[model samples]
Target: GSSPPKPGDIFEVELAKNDNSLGISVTVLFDKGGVNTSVRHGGIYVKAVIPQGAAESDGRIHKGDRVLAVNGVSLEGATHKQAVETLRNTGQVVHLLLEKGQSPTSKE
Candidate 1:
């Protein structure tokens, strides 16, 4: 069996801008319509990390990883638009705080 993903699984990764882009796709769960729907509480999720891009080259980010922070800004409970702009505004070097987990399943 594999190790269960615990709160302790959280880690930080630094991605440098490549052509002024981080080359990562993200989605906010439980946001506005057309977005993934869920309970009001939400966080930014890493949907894709493009090949040869900073995130992919770093090889630390994984699909379904929850981005808890961008740079030093907190993304917990942040709106989709707010989170997008926060990440977009970070300079050349970007710092990301992430928690490891896949989509939540019906269990508790």
Candidate 2:
């Protein structure tokens, strides 16, 4: 069997929201640094850092949360291509099952 991959490895970013929308639209940044695996881009690219507005206003999804699945499909070990494909197949508004962060109201 193949060995597990190294840590800090960067994978592709899969957009789960509207293709034409701007700002922090449901996105997952696949990385091999931690066990949870995939986390939302919290900085400028996503601007999900802001709490109680836009993304947060939706109530529930938060920055730094790890995405475990999309509409019930696990993405723990999915390749970048596989993740993108899965997200796309969900059509619009992919319901992401994420590991909520500690401080859901704070910026990271």
Candidate 3:
């Protein structure tokens, strides 16, 4: 089950100046072009990560780390736009607070 988001999830997101290696990005709905939130999970989840990205090079980020902050700012309850903007303003160097856990569906 999805755990209720907590303040402890907060963290920063930064990347190399020459490498936009933080291959993670998010999704939003527009018109009929969005995931069904009523039945699907929500809260700025990690959509994808490129193996060639710097995040992979850094060796700390993974496929499921939830982004909780940008540049020392709290991402809790932050609007999608605000979160995106904060990320944009953080420059090539990004600081992100993230977490990972075993899925409720996982037995291992």
Candidate 4:
């Protein structure tokens, strides 16, 4: 079936955690690079929003939402591992910019 192209959805989400728990898991779509060795290129996506967690309570976050930035910091070129570190540095309150899209690894 033929379909017309649609504009991608972009929005921001803000969450404040209790006990330092954002309750979300994420995955990166590209390869990892060494520190100062070169540059890493990729996008990070929401893998899961754990049950009854901060992300779940927020009710705005969804699985597979592309994470463009965290607390005004860009996640572009950041590896999956590096992304976690960046997220942890956010203290308690987290600001997320998300793009809605289908994940390449998602089920049909």
Q: Which candidate wins on lDDT?
A: 1
lDDT tens per residue, model 3, 1-108: 655334334323456556563554444211111122222221344433445655544222433334444333445545355455543444456555554431433222
Show the colliding residue pairs in model 4.
none
lDDT over C-alpha atoms for residue 64 of model 4: 56
Window of ten residues with lowest summed lDDT in model 4? 30-39
| Lowest-sum lDDT 10-residue window in model 2 | 41-50
Lowest-sum lDDT 10-residue window in model 1: 28-37
Model 3 segments more than 4 A misplaced: 1-13, 28-43, 58-60, 87-91, 101-108
Tens digit of per-residue lDDT, candidate 2, span 1-108: 766332122212233455421123334332321133434421111233224333233222333444455334455645254444443344344343444443334543
Estimate, for each residue in 5-102, the C-alpha lDDT of model 4 and write its tens digit: 22245555466655543556544322221111122322445544567655554333555545455444555645344555644444366655545554
For model 2, the superposed segments whose C-alpha errors exceed 4 Å read 1-60, 85-91, 101-105
| Candidate 3: C-alpha lDDT | 0.40
* C-alpha-based local distance difference test score of model 2: 0.35
What does the lDDT read for residue 7 in candidate 3?
A: 33
- Regions of candidate 1 where Cα sits further than 4 Å from its true position: 1-8, 18-21, 28-42, 58-60, 80-82, 104-108
| Candidate 1 residue lDDT tens string, 75-106 | 56564554566445543666656555456642
TM-score of 3: 0.49
